[PDB]
Amino acid sequence: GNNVVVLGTQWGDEGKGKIVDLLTERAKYVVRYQGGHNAGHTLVINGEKTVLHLIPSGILRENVTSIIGNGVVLSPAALMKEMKELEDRGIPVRERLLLSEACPLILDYHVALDNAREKARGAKAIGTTGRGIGPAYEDKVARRGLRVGDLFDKETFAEKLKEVMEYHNFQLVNYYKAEAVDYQKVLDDTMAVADILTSMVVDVSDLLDQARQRGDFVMFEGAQGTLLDIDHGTYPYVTSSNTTAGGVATGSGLGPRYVDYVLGILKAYSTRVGAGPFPTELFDETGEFLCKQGNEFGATTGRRRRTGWLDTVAVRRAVQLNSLSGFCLTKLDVLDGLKEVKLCVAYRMPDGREVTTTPLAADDWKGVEPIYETMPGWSESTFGVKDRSGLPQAALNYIKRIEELTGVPIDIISTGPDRTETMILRDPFDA
């Protein structure tokens, strides 16, 4: 189908970037519809590494127009920052990237607040990336936030910003007893890049409407993961945006009926970065092994990711929430060497019940326990394989099992960070 969606089923870091970059070969457009620069999508072409945050994972391709949709919270500083680095490496970002005037702007004070709010939580801190995503989303919904479009008139922008910062500073100064952000400094840093910024503006909805009617291949690239959804995730240990497929339509302007394929990116095991429920979490040799073998560190904060077995109970929440058409099974290779591999098939509630559905808010996950199905591991190397034939029967079995347990076909299998260490079995652009 023309419109293909690529999002994280678990808790982010499944490998969305890599799959976006590999599938965009046929795409005219790639659109990030939510998140900000908390995302850290790692691309790897012939070993050259690139971790993108704010800029879409289609940038390395000239044939693709990279779009930052209205649903994304935009940090002008982060953009220039990533833009230049990409430019020095021969990526004419500016020549291939478009923006939404609706995009709310993340400015320094948003990080002051995000910082303040996290400390104030003490032991109960979310584990935010520190980029100010939340405060930006807050101001948005509040209707006091500034968006890309406010830059069209620098005089009124300065006025608007003044009020905003005043309000924000009152609280940072008085309630939090925090260091106040300087208005003049924010105004200057921003105006220094406004033209560049505004130069990339496009009417993203209308674009997608016409690109749609034309039959063009659009790829929407997600940020974070399903269980981090502001609504459906382990609230409040979530991200402030709708990481679920519904976000595609709200964060871009493309009507919901135009989604043709939702590919759920699914890692061979599970990880979490930040605080929050994790039934299948491993704190043993296997835990460290999974970490070590899969270089599980934040592509944005460098924090150690928590590791655990693949959770089928929670993945099926992802299935229904997202309208998955298929899964792309990533990082199978990291499982090589393990004698047995486990997959949680059910949850044992603290009251005794065996359930196969998941809790919602974090509190409701407290004493929940995982029930596994233990399958044979494999000795063979999986890394770099691009043909099921190269996969040992155990792995194939493990793949079939996941499919059985979910009722969704694993259309793509990834065997390495490199764009080429993958096997596409069914290409979403054909379905």
Added chain:
Amino acid sequence: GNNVVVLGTQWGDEGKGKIVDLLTERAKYVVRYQGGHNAGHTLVINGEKTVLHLIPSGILRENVTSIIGNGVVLSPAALMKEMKELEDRGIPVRERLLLSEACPLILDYHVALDNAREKARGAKAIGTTGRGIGPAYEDKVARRGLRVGDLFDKETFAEKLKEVMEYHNFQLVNYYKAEAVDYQKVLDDTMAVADILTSMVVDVSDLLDQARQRGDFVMFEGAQGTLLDIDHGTYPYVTSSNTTAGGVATGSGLGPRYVDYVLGILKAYSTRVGAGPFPTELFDETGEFLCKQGNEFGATTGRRRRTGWLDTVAVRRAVQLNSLSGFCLTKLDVLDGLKEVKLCVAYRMPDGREVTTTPLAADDWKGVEPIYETMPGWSESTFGVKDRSGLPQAALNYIKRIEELTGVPIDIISTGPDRTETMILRDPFDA
């Protein structure tokens, strides 16, 4: 199609309630996915009137299960308030209504803030309904808000609420120099209804997933209108929720691919309640006539609604944003008697250009001017007609024209507030 969406194309008050109540005859479920009690949907059966706010417009039917989806901001006070009134009238609300534990809770302090924030805007006040929708949405996205589920543990709820209210009161007291809301009073009022509240909780996503696989007829009922969308509307003179079709999926948990039909409710003319751009606004006899003839007053605040001609430019923004499958043309009857009726076909930008697309943020709408197409009015009565044959050729022409100008069929035509003064031409449940 099984899953039918009914939302406001313009600026709310198009007649969503009436159409939900009329189409639910075949529905097993009706789901409100966004908004709160700012909505005021008026139903009218054999002249008996009912204006619903928070409770879905399927309530008057026993065969229908009414759902308040996660995307809705829930005011426990408003619920009990509406619940009892409905009950005294023989509507066993409790026996037919379900809720989401994800639903954020709107509590008294949210109204203090919404009040404070509006005055602080002075001349630039949004024109909020005063129900505290925004602050509730803010806290949500902020990750400090309380949701229905927090009630499962009253002790931790009280703790949580305490912190929350402390934080909120600091600002109401110090920054705004406003009256502080009393913690104890909020705690008590709330706990008095928690059990009733929690008694209606259901896992809405999973419900919809199974109801979906079963082939059941679901109806999603929208609140407000398309140009009030937090992202795509005339920001900041908008509502804090995603009134666009993308909201259905984010505010319920039903995967985006499961929408089968999006019926855009379209009024025969235009109205706005609150501040904000309105190209076709009428301040003349026609303006007052439209007001008078269509009893254009807020079904929630009783404010006088602003009236204007039907705007085709903005309606087409609604078309693409929403994936409209069809329009339900409402309040044609109110046009009876007019010598000529106008419909804006284009916008004259303040720089001279003729455009047929719309601006985004409110500021960008400033000097914009409407270009009309003037059509013949009609003398005949339209009110109560349920057969196109009863519609005079002028009206039919006016209908064809709207269709020509949009490329979307007017599947339903409404000729009165009563459920029966309507003609369904194509029933969304069949498409």
